[PDB]
Design a protein around this ligand. Sequence first.
Ligand code: NI
Length: 341
Amino acid sequence: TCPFYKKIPGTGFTVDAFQYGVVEGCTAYFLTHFHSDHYAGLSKHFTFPVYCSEITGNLLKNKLHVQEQYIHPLPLDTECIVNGVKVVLLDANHCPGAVMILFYLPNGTVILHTGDFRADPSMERSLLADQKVHMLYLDTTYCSPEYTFPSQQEVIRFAINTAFEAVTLNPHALVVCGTYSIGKEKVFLAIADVLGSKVGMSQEKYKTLQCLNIPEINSLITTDMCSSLVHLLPMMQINFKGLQSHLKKCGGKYNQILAFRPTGWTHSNKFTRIADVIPQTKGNISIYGIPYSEHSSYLEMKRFVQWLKPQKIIPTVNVGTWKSRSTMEKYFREWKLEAGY
Ligand code: NI
């Protein structure tokens, strides 16, 4: 049955709640972003209103075949009225088309649902700064102090310099990047840009990327693998077996693979600096795991919440164990006592 943390009190609304069948008394279904744990249950047979960003609405129509008449795309940073309730969509700094939702309840409560997000100081200068928020439904994916990672910029710098060095030393090396959902496009696009190549990929992934309003995208991507030296493959294929196989398929155009696996967190982060990351190598195949995150680190999350000073926090991630739930609640209390709210 729909969990309470997917329900907006004082409304008929749910958030990212498409796998429960008909939610009793739900009059509008919001979808924060096009990731499968969040959209699970949507299809062409869905007949209730879905509210989302334009980008998410492009993916609903073209990838899942949801009928146009049930898709209600909203512009960002704009006050809109949904079943008589004022809402605002904000950028979540997650994947393309990912939003946070501000709800202005008839009774005067203000609720922010972060969806999935990577907190950033730039958020402290959106429409959020203009009023107080009573309840925060928070993406707590990495809500423990061991979760530190570098800025997205430092990670991309590492990958561009790595790839450029390797292909300059060996003009017959192939670069491969893994993916399993939208997000992290900067990894492969930045690498192709410094090499003067387009990124080659399957037809289904090219279609997905064409839904995202990325500027000049027809200049960066292609379904012709032969004319490309940066290839995008399913994340599952980013291993020595999968890559040896792929290399065979290129028919002696290439003799070396350099592959990147943008992961979430990995425990080398507590110890290792980005400067200090090394690949795993077998034969003429090297694999780099790089900590390119689109969720908040512990410290980024803490800053955001201490800035916003909500009255009540409802976690949306890691809620399934008592030890997790209890630990998070302890961090929220420290944050509030340290900051004085
Ligand atoms: Ni997500």
